[PDB]
Design a protein around this ligand. Structure first.
Ligand code: HDD
Ligand code: HDD
Ligand SMILES: [Ca+2]
Ligand SMILES: [Ca+2]
Ligand SMILES: [Ca+2]
Ligand SMILES: [Ca+2]
Ligand SMILES: [Ca+2]
Ligand SMILES: [Ca+2]
Lengths: 673, 671, 355
């Protein structure tokens, strides 16, 4: 796909960058025990390269991972958009997607609580088109000029740069409580959507209203929703924290492995479509990026399939260097006057100058389009092209008037939706139509199941208890109280403040479909889910049991890890390196019951893996018939939902696989009365 | 100080642009109240352009780290051994800035990764800035600087998928170690508790290389720098470090920040081993070889002065992120040696600042400026902050009367190369045969550790090598480990189900050396700043009473006390939900809380007990004050397990436990 | 000078932009281009670019960051820094504000206003306002440039445009390039004039201080250097910058003929003691006379001081009665007359006109 730019080093002698054969293992010295010589060009070229390997990390979404794939259209969408990539049933377009967290630096953990990026480039036959989205459909703020305020507040305090990848500190909650627009996204981030089980188990949203524009100039208002075919799933917070330490690379590894195993993730690329006349018809302003359109008002239309099926060859060249822009737009799509979107258009063209160090960043392989380029852009640091046209100005006669202007009527030009207008004073004023910051956060909260509501309350209790300023904590309660008095009381209880009196102005009992993770039902597929089989080398029969289970589990596309004290044929991991965060379900073979002290692993390790998996809600069980020794030691009830005990390997697996699809047994978590 | 002059106060005043025009920055300028944003909105673009350009490349190595300001005070007039001005008088004070770091992780990676740690110290002397860019381990992995990109590529994440972060626990790292046997000495150090220090304050600093001290008369001696912690040496255990990485990625930078804010700034004795030039090969190895220590039995330490860190930075980016260290920042009285690792570093640190700063005037950043006048003919360059009055910046000149004047051994206190230094022989890209013993000193190190310390090192290797996929790499690893110690090769092999190769006794020996063991270094000389978690409950007025009494008795001894309960209130610092054993050096349960150890919506199931059990398992002093020990399966007569009804008696015993720091009898040993 | 980074976006309360689409886009370019020049975002911190008042904002970090900011809560709105810095606007803190009467209305368009369509009447207004010799110079500048254009089509296209401003300009330019001018197109022709755009018609200079006078002298004759010295004294009194030129340097001589040129002077005087100069290994053949002749041809005041002028003036083919040509024995009288010529500046009667 980028094959043309690949460099192979599987054979050959070492050369400099100018193809002179050299060595690179010993410096040139004046005598065998002498000083190194300035004339050693082999040394200096290699070290200068190394000294300059790093580029600035992205200002936000610095931590992330990418893959290549394909988008396939389900129809000819000409009747709603001129977009070429959408113009025929089965039309294919290459894509590259990068997923990310938002706040943390390079190297911070995948499993921080955060808003996640989901940025998709379509390399279309009429230019690159990017949709730079998040896993949450609403943003914290209503005007792009506020972005540095939001980001400074959630990033580490700038005197000591603490804490990494976390909103659990005074400045973040000061901002949230002073800027009430933040409530909706905050409720999403405090739900399971802040800690997704993988990039493959979350959705993607454009967030803003955009326009679809037909060739006749007519337009409709749209929202992009990329709906996961893997299902929605989250971690529990206590599991996310341990995973952040045991495997900071958990999400990138999950994606890489799914692709390598021929299980590339899929999404249906969808839109909600509404008329221009419906911009203020739903009880809020479609220009407001803190609002969703409830699906009860506008259903999803499926446009096509997005599948990721090829991993990069070089992470730096491809994933690190990919430079997304919402200004990478194509004919058939247009912007709206959403003031958050409007300012983004400036930022993403500017910020690539910082990353790339020069203006020719669209020339890097990963950023190039797959069609020819005809324009009068010239020179600049790192210019890779050798332009033939020696008259790069318009209008010209000396290059016969080429390149030609493209527009609505010639050359398939981009064109602004011609029905768009502006009126009124030039103002730095917020539309009063944006003023209701609380009804939709309540809508979201109402739409979660009871244990889901508890999890969200518990995330807030956790974070807010770490805020040192008692004035900030009180201001936080003030805002939460406007969304829900009950939320405010329950959060308050953990921080030993009293909630303020109920303020019912924005309270309501409406709900909306499709936002709950717990309520979204069993996963539609269990392929790629991870099963840890805890065994022992003490008993050759435990290994036999583990081997039998492996065969039966692998046949259904599960990733099986057999754990024992030491490695040997059939054993993948030792106890010392194993952890419950490594598995979606845990099985003990009954031949290993005795393990439930050694110099080979920490004290209590085999039992702790089982107890953790249980307490985090995972399917757990014992295969073989003798289960009471293990279940009693773990304090797990044999009759529990998501707890399995069978002698029959086949029967055990049948029941256990139903549990992997349920994914989490929410009845193991306590609820406020 | 260049820093005070550049401080900007924003505690009052109206918002302005960068050119002083009062503005607003909260709403974009639009054509109509629901209209599109205007290009003419200069307020928007200046603010967003700044934000868009806030980041700079992280350091190519040691990207994760944290700094503090302080002072160095000389103990003596050291003129008898060096011309260095900062060492020329008893009591002479020089400002310092120190940055500590890991090595392999990117700038947002965890402090408690297993790794070699940086300890870089700038002395802003009255004869120029002098940097000692050191590590917490006295030896390095490689013998020639040209190999640095090989080492670093091999330990950093695999370049197709950028996995794993901040870890040597992957095939490429062990492939490099096993193919490049010089790595063994540092590998052994990094696999010991020195790979996971308890804090920046509980580790030493080493210059690693042999340097020269040069007197004004031109004579020279060979030296090694050793910064010796006054806080004592202490490590984490690996299972604890892993949890900590997740629970608090900022643990070391927080520990340092807090110690300084509380008036407990950390201290080191700055020391040297000093030997004659004639002893370059007298100790059984070559002093030019950065993989070798001089055992303290052959050369004792001389204490030169006190380093104390006592002020945190004002802006982390401006000071910590932008500090640009160089071993090329050298002063009269100090010289280089022909160590091929040191030699190449001189080039790299001047060059790499161009990448970080984006231009050549990086020495003009306030944190990089000297504390004396600059007189030279360097001109122009992006970001030039000076206005030079000398319009004849060339030498030799008459039109500026010959200024600036040349400085040298006999004029202007110039730097000069040690005049006894020579070179002889062919111009070669050959390794000295004197560098060839890659295994005897790793064995010396291993021999010098205590039995449980040796067990911890074995277990670290068992952990990492079991994650290497390649059977071929694992076998090559055992081959090298076997050349250091057959017993190590056997014990590591047991974990990975391979057979160790037969004993090869070429480099085996039984010698030991003082000062390298953490466990063996005795109780900590101070317990100030150490953290005690008191596990209490709100459901008992007795529980919060017992907690409050303990707090008084522990706090007056300088300990940092965290009372933990179900919910916050007066006297309670942390909820169970946010608490973890990694947050404490000792854990105390008040007996009034015993019911919690037997479900709540306010914390995860079994959290109170898990804290106590984890703390015990990790070797910490633990106690019950006033079935808790039963519930935890903690033996009441265990060393570092305390059970008293008396508050004063409990605290006295417990604080001895804190000094002992770890109770190593709780860890299983290979037979 | 090299590092000063100007921006029309550096605006202050009391001034605002207009919807001139050239101005509008400049606002973007000048903020962006300093990133290229400075290589980083902190260019306003260079000394030449700093303001002379305090800066209070939440811009942070970036390569080359010279400030150490004390405020550790750089976001708005905040309570942890007591809401500082405060927002400035029309009603508080002397904020900049957009003129509140400004509006926009209509479609979002990439269209040119038809009010911009007359490209030719004002060029003709300007041309009409120049003096006859000034018009000739402009025609001569176009004849020079267009003659160097290789494309005959481009040259034809150039005459089509020029012709829309002035048929006479097109005809006169066409003449130099051996093309015919297209037929008169009178849509935008007119006879109107405007004040203050002509150089030639703006009258004598209001001051001659700093103007340059080259005195051509010789070392052969002690009398020539004495004349040059007296002239120097009288001319320096009036703030003129005097250069005495001779074959070689010595006390009172500033420049050799080898390095001297008429372009170095606003007026040129030969002292009559130097008449014989008007071959040496010391300067190119004919250099002294060439300086005088060039000065005359380019319109400058020129003269001979000392009483004997005919030898020099005849050698130069310069008429003794010409305007801007001076000859007096009296230093005082010479200087008085010559200084009038320096204020006149250029004697435009020396240039040929199209007929
Ligand atoms: C005006 C500033 C601004 C605002 C309001 C936003 N962003 Fe942004 N975003 C940036 C300024 C920016 C940036 C500084 O320009 C970044 C950093 C690196 C880059 O290429 O662009 C960026 C990066 C970035 C990435 C990483 C792309 C990648 O993987 O390389 C994603 C997914 C988003 N953003 C998504 C959003 C969404 C869903 C927003 C609200 C709807 C949003 N951003 C508002
Ligand atoms: C030839 C390359 C090379 C070699 C052989 C070394 N280093 Fe280095 N080191 C660098 C090239 C480098 C560098 C790329 O130049 C860095 C990155 C950031 C910087 O300022 O310099 C650096 C950074 C750096 C830092 C971070 C300083 C700070 O906190 O900002 C420390 C502590 C060390 N190094 C210590 C060492 C030690 C103790 C070495 C062996 C004795 C060593 N380095 C060998
Ligand atoms: Ca904070
Ligand atoms: Ca959930
Ligand atoms: Ca258009
Ligand atoms: Ca690897
Ligand atoms: Ca240890
Ligand atoms: Ca640059």
């Amino acid at each position: 796909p980028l094959a043309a730019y690949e460099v192979d080093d599987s054979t050959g002698y070492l050369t400099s960058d100018v193809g002179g054969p050299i060595q690179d293992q010993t410096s040139l010295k004046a005598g065998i025990r002498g000083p190194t010589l300035l004339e050693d060009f082999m040394f200096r070229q290699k070290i200068q390269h190394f000294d300059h390997e790093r580029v600035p990390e992205r200002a936000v979404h610095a931590r992330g991972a990418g893959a290549h794939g394909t988008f396939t259209s389900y129809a000819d969408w000409s009747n709603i958009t001129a977009a070429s990539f959408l113009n025929a049933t089965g039309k294919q377009t290459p894509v590259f997607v990068r997923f990310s967290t938002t706040a943390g630096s390079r190297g911070s953990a995948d499993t921080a609580r955060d808003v996640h990026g989901f940025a998709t480039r379509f390399y279309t036959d009429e230019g690159n088109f990017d949709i730079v989205g998040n896993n949450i459909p609403v943003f914290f703020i209503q005007d792009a000029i506020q972005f540095p305020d939001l980001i400074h507040s959630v990033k580490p305090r700038p005197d000591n740069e603490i804490p990494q990848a976390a909103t659990a500190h005074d400045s973040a909650w000061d901002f949230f409580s002073q800027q009430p627009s933040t409530m909706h996204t905050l409720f999403w981030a405090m739900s399971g959507h802040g800690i997704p089980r993988s990039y493959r188990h979350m959705d993607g949203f454009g967030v803003h209203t955009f326009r679809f524009v037909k060739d006749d100039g007519s337009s409709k208002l749209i929202k992009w929703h990329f709906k996961s075919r893997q299902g929605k799933a989250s971690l529990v917070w206590e599991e996310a924290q341990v995973l952040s330490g045991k495997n900071a690379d958990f999400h990138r590894q999950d994606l890489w492995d799914a692709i390598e195993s021929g299980n590339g993730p899929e999404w249906d690329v969808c839109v909600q479509i509404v008329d221009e006349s419906q911009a203020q018809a739903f009880g809020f302003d479609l220009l407001d990026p803190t609002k969703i359109i409830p699906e009860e008002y506008a259903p999803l239309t499926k446009l096509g399939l997005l599948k990721l099926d090829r991993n990069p060859t070089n992470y730096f060249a491809e994933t690190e260097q990919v430079m997304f822009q919402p200004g990478h737009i194509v004919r058939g799509i247009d912007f709206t006057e959403d003031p958050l979107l409007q300012g983004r258009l400036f930022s993403y063209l500017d910020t690539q100058l910082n990353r790339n160090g020069g203006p020719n960043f669209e020339q890097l392989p990963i950023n190039m389009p797959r069609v020819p380029i005809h324009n009068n852009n010239r020179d600049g640091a790192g210019q890779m092209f050798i332009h033939r046209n020696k008259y790069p100005y318009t209008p010209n006669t000396l290059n016969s008037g080429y390149p030609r202007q493209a527009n609505q009527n010639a050359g398939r030009g981009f064109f602004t939706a011609p029905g768009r207008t502006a009126s009124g004073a030039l103002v730095r004023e917020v539309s009063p139509t944006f003023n209701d910051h609380w009804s939709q956060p309540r809508l979201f909260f109402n739409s979660l199941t009871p244990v889901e509501q508890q999890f969200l309350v518990n995330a807030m209790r956790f974070e807010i208890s770490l805020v040192k300023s008692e004035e900030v904590k009180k201001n936080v309660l003030t805002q939460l109280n406007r969304v829900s008095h009950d939320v405010a009381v329950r959060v308050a209880a953990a921080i030993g403040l009293g909630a303020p009196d109920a303020d019912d102005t924005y309270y309501h009992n409406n709900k909306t479909a499709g936002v709950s993770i717990v309520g979204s039902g069993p996963l539609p597929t269990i392929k790629t889910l991870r099963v840890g089989i805890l065994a022992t080398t003490s008993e050759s029969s435990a290994l036999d049991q583990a081997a039998q289970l492996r065969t039966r589990l692998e046949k259904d596309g599960l990733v099986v890890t057999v754990v024992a004290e030491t490695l040997r044929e059939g054993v993948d991991q030792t106890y010392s390196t194993a952890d419950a965060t490594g598995f979606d379900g845990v099985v003990v073979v009954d031949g290993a019951a005795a393990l439930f002290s050694s110099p080979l692993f920490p004290t209590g390790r085999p039992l702790q893996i089982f107890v953790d998996a249980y307490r985090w809600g995972k399917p757990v069980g014992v295969c073989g018939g003798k289960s009471s020794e293990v279940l009693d030691a773990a304090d797990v009830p044999e009759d529990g939902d998501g707890v399995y005990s069978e002698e029959s390997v086949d029967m055990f697996v049948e029941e256990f696989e139903k549990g992997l699809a349920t994914f989490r047994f929410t009845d193991r978590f306590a609820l406020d009365s």
